[PDB]
Amino acid sequence: TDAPVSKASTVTGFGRGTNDVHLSGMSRISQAVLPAGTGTDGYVVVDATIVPDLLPRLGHAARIFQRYAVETLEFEIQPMCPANTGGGYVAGFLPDPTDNDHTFDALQATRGAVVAKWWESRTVRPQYTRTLLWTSSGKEQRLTSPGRLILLCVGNNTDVVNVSVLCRWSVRLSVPSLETP
Amino acid sequence: TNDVHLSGMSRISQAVLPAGTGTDGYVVVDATIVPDLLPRLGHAARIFQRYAVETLEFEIQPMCPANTGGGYVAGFLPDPTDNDHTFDALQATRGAVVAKWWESRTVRPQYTRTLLWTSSGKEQRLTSPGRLILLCVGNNTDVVNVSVLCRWSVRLSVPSLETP
Amino acid sequence: TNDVHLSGMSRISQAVLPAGTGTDGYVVVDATIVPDLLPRLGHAARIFQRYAVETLEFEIQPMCPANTGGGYVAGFLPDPTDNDHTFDALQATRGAVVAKWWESRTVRPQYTRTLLWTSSGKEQRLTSPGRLILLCVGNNTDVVNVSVLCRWSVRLSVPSLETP
Amino acid sequence: TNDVHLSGMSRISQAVLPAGTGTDGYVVVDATIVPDLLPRLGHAARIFQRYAVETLEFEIQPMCPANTGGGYVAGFLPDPTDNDHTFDALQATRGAVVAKWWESRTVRPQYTRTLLWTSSGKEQRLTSPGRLILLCVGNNTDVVNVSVLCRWSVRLSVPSLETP
Amino acid sequence: TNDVHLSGMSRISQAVLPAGTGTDGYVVVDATIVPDLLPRLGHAARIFQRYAVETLEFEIQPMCPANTGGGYVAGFLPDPTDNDHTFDALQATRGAVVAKWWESRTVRPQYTRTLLWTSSGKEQRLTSPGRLILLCVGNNTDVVNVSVLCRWSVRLSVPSLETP
Amino acid sequence: TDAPVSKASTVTGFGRGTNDVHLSGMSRISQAVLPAGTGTDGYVVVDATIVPDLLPRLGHAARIFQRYAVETLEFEIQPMCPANTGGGYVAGFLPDPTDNDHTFDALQATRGAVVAKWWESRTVRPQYTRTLLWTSSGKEQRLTSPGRLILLCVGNNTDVVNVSVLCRWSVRLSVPSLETP
Ligand SMILES: [Ca+2]
Ligand SMILES: [Ca+2]
Ligand SMILES: [Ca+2]
Ligand SMILES: [Ca+2]
Ligand SMILES: [Ca+2]
Ligand SMILES: [Ca+2]
């Protein structure tokens, strides 16, 4: 071969990363300790917006991706109080992150909402958006979070209640990037 | 057409029965089942004139300690004009249940499937499928927090705005 | 499924433009078409979450003395964020109409057939199919009472109760 | 291919004819239909080179007091170079209309279905399908505001950017 | 319908990097790809409300002597709100390229095919498919005249005139 | 059913996360700018220990895993200097992280080492350990890093050289956890 003025660049494998990871797992999105007698009807025990940052192991994975799509979402309310406590709880998943209404009727309207006594556990199988949602935050949060889990006291509680909200997320990240805080 | 079909669960009544005030025959919840009581169906019927119940299944959640003493009986009179609030009416009707204060039961009632009206009238016989009664069988020991959740599925028609 | 197909007519706005102030380019009815404006859809949106406008048609119904010698132009900008109130912007939009103050007209615009959100929010392009603008083209000799009726056919979905 | 089929409505002209000067044979709206006049087609012609008018229909929309006792005649001469402004020339052309000042009318002319040029040039017979002429047939007692709306369906081709 | 399909090449940005001012990490072109930047598509989107990118292929032509020392790296973030302007973001994304200052490369990016809006909004996430970044890897020796030409092919809809 | 003193816990899906992700990609491990005349024989241009922290997108993924195994490792030296510069470079991968020797012979001994002129690019296909390595640091680094890449100036450089070391890693993380800094 001859000697050129400047040789051509030989970078072949650039910008060819993997664009599909089906990360999944289970994590605790909220832990609450209700003092006795403060579980008044309508009190908001848990108000958690489902974002990749909220889920611990999903936050780092979404930091290196642009868009994620929730493939399977399920919640499991697991109170740890004894069986001699009186009162009820309601758990639901509002599919609109901007909604700020916190009433029993609002949760009861949504599909998959559960009402139970504090000495009994329930699973909230919700209705979420299957579309692609951006990992990073923005002006409108409806493109970033599938919804918000809300857990209220239906009735006045007698003893101290230690509730724990668990989430079984299953996402499919795509559009590789190196998103930064 | 205008056959809007709606369904969902809604708490018709939340009641707090105090401890030691559970004399037998005391009525905890005496509710005429009109669409106004149901929150979502209340908003739905405020913009409609006629509805027709297609599936009605009440379910009772009392939040009480498992060691409480007492019981509840529930029934659904298919006649809204009935004013009898005794155990006899409940035990006569179909789908009535009786249970302890910590148990959850479903009152699967016998309701009418005709087209009723979403607004008040001279007679309730064309405005509501019936009346739910919950009575306190036996004397309660602790405080009772009962909530009656109604699984309803109606079909609305004749669009028209209404004011309560 | 959970979809309900509702339809009806509503008066989004009614304005009394005084005589002599009907200068060209003066906004008369500048309304944003959200479910709140339509009363029946206002009640029906409170019990749902996401709607899609399947059919939208406006009617200008001025009520003026025949001596009035002015005109109006009506249009439906499919961009809620648009703040342009000029004649050309209206006329370019599909279905825009120009008429005299003594002739009712119909506007058949090009609504976006996407699933919007019933509730309000930070971005209006996801909550409103558009906004109607009516301009008084010519000076009117008499006071003109203009009413902008609307005919809508939405498809609600994702049942959920909400608050104003 | 490179062809795009656009359509819309536009106000080619709007004229305030004062009371008393509505003599017969007085030109009111004498406009040449080039893409410049139509705003949306004005923007769309700057990104193309050759267009063909597939459908062209005008609407006269006068806004006058009912006391006005004059009339108008509207026509579309398919020759841009024509400088004749007489009643017979208008009436002979296909689609010409005669009406009173309180009746909107539609003109459906015979446009030439050939591929013209979006840009201007030395000969106007290759750049404009024609020209609209409106004459005030009778004397008007009141001031008349006349608006000439246009409905066009062009087929642009030969993509290229241009300058005004 | 109104599915106007357009395509063609257009220079998004012409930049003149001075000699000896090529510190590593210096951003030469940081352009949010809205239709306004593209000349022909700018005119096209001034008469439309929604567009949907169907084929996007940037190509870089630097006019430099073959003996110049330095290099350029180019990438396309599919998120317009991203403000990171470092080599890490480019090397992370798909289709990014790095080359010498005399070479021409095509940045075949990963873009969204949804229907965006042709006008500004609160969020850029519905107005532009992404953001192109060109960084100066290494220190330039001579003066650099870089031009980024965008092969675009979009589909517009919802006719409406707009003013920038 | 009867009413027990205390009901049994119903947490079923606990500690059942995914233990296999084949994360892969390419990243720049070092960027150097050598001033003219300072490329003396033996000068250490690049001395990079291959750890999950060094690789940007791999750091977050290894933060949520215990052990990783390098399935495919390849380096690509890509100088950006013109074709009129004189001098050479040597690139190699020492498979022993504790080794601190920095000489031309040490690199030349290892398999896959490359010697070239500065106006020409080379790929370093090294010999690495296929065994499982812990993600987190410890007392002995030989259980955490496959090796160390070293890039030296073979001869004196004439002009300014801007070298860039790229790595094509391909790991297989396992043993899920939530390792913390
Ligand atoms: Ca982002
Ligand atoms: Ca009524
Ligand atoms: Ca909402
Ligand atoms: Ca031309
Ligand atoms: Ca707009
Ligand atoms: Ca560890």
Chains with at least 3 CB pairs less than 8 angstroms from chain A = B, C, E, F
Is there contact between B and A if contact means ≥3 C-beta pairs under 8 Å?
Answer: yes
Give the three-state DSSP class for A170. strand
> How many Å apart are CA E138 and CA E28, to the nearest integer?
13
Round the CA-based radius of gyration of chain D to a whole number and report it. Answer: 16
Contacts of D1 in chain E (CB under 8 A): none
Indicate the residue type of A18: T
Quick one: which of D115, E2, B130, D124 has its CA closest to C95? E2
CA distance to A46, A69, A131, E11, E34, per residue, from A128 (Å): 19, 10, 9, 42, 31
Tell me how far CA of residue E90 lies from CA of A19, E55, E71, E80, F55, in angstroms.
15, 20, 14, 14, 15
Hey, are the CB atoms on C137 and D149 less than 8 Å from each other? no
**Partners of C16 in beta bridges:** C145
Inter-chain CB pairs, A–B, below 8 Å:
69
Cα–Cα distance, F181 to F175 (Å, whole number): 17
Strand partners, F94: F148
Contact A100, A141 (CB under 8 A): no
Alpha carbon distance A168, F151 (integer Å): 47
* Secondary element (H or E) of residue D89: helix D87-92
**Short-list F86, F165, F164, CA closest to F118:** F86
Dist. CA A79–CA A151, nearest whole Å: 12
Dihedral angle, C-alpha E43, E48, E54, E59, nearest 10 °: 20
> What does this entry list as its resolution, in Å?
3.1
Please provide residue F42's backbone torsions phi and psi, each rounded to the nearest 5 degrees: 100, -10
**Residue A96: how many other CB atoms lie within 10 Å:** 24
Q: Which residues surround ligand 6, an ion (CB under 5 A)?
A: F 66, 136, 179
Instruction: Name the residue among A122, A115, A77 with its Cα closest to residue B149.
Output: A115
Q: Among all residues of chain B, which has the CA nearest to that of F1?
A: B103
CA distance A74 to chain B (A): 20
Going C13 to C19 to C21 to C24, the CA torsion angle's sign is positive
| Structure tokens that stand for D162 in this block | 């241009």
Task: Tell me which chain F residues have a C-beta less than 8 angstroms from the C-beta of E138.
Answer: 33, 80, 162
Closest CA to E11 of E37, E30, E29: E37
Name the token pair of E85: 């302007």
Q: Could you say which DSSP state residue A21 is in?
A: B
CA dihedral E77, E83, E86, E91 (to 10 degrees): -20
Q: What whole-number distance in Å separates Cα of residue C8 and Cα of residue C35?
A: 12
Q: Which of A83, A125, A101 is nearest to A42 (CA)?
A: A101
The alpha-carbon gap from E161 to the nearest alpha carbon of chain F, in Å, equals: 45
Going by C-alpha positions, the residue among C86, E44, C74 that lies closest to residue D6 is E44
Residues of F in contact with A18 (CB under 8 A): 23-25
The separation between CA E116 and the C-alpha centre of its own chain, rounded to angstroms, equals: 17
Buried b (16+ CB within 10 A) or exposed e, A159-175: bebebbbbbbbbbbbbb
Tell if the CB–CB gap between E5 and D6 is shorter than 8 Å.
Answer: no
E117 to C125: CB separation less than 8 angstroms, yes or no: yes
Residues lining ion ligand 2 (Cβ < 5 A) are B 119
CB pairs under 8 A between A and C: 43
3-state secondary structure of B89: helix
Flag if C100 and D64 touch (Cβ within 8 Å).
Answer: yes
Q: Return the sign of the alpha-carbon dihedral for residues C97, C99, C101, C106.
A: negative
Nearest partner of E111 among E31, E54, E41, judged by Cα: E54
D38, C96 contact by CB (below 8 A): no
CA–centroid distance, B78 to ligand 2, in Å, is: 22
Q: Which helix (H) or strand (E) holds D7?
A: strand D4-17
Q: Using the mean position of ligand 2's atoms as its centre, give its distance from the Cα of residue C37 in Å.
A: 22
Q: Measure in Å the smallest separation between the Cα of D8 and chain C Cα atoms.
A: 6
Q: Give the neighbor-by-neighbor strand order of the sheet with C97-100.
A: C26-32, C131-136, C71-77, C97-100
CB contact under 8 A, E125 and A136: no
DSSP labels, D38-61: SHHHHHHHTT-SEEEEEEEEEEE-
Is the CB of A85 less than 8 angstroms away from the CB of B65? yes
The three-state DSSP-derived secondary structure of E61-89 is EEECCCCCCCEEEEEEECCCCCCCCCHHH
Nearest CA distance, E47 vs chain D (angstrom):
6
Roughly how many angstroms between the first and final C-alpha of chain F, as a whole number? Answer: 49
Map residue E42 onto helix, strand or coil.
Answer: helix
CA of C160 to the centre of ligand 3 (A): 8
D7 closest CA partner among D38, D48, D49: D38
CA distance A170 to chain F (A): 11
What separation in Å is there between the alpha carbon of A46 and the centre of ligand 5? 39
Closest Cα partner for C23 from C72, C80, C96?
C72
Check: CB of residue A99 under 8 Å from CB of residue C46: no
User: Chain-centre distance of CA F8, in angstroms?
Assistant: 49
DSSP codes joined into one string, C60-73: E--B--TT---EEE
In this structure, the strands spanning D50-60 and D105-107 are antiparallel
Cα C21 to the chain's mean position, in Å?
22
- Cβ contact B138:B68 at 8 Å: no
Q: Distance between CA atoms of F47 and F29, rounded to whole angstroms?
A: 10
| Ligand 6 centroid from CA F128, angstroms | 21
**Would you call E10 exposed, middle or buried from its count of C-beta atoms within 10 A (0-12, 13-18, 19+)?**
middle
Of residues C107, C113, C116, C109, the one with CA closest to residue C149: C107
The ligand whose atoms approach the alpha carbon of C117 most closely is 3
Q: Concatenate the DSSP letters of all residues of chain F into one string.
A: ----SSPPP---S-S-----B--EEEEEEEEEEEPTT---TT-EEEEEE--TTTSHHHHHHHHTEEEEEEEEEEEEE-----TT---EEEEEEES-TT-----HHHHHHSTT-EEEETTS-EEE------S-EESS--S-GGGT-S-EEEEEESS--SS-EEEEEEEEEEEEEEEE-----
**F156, F87 Cβ separation under 8 angstroms:** yes
Strand A65-77 and strand E71-77: pairing? unpaired
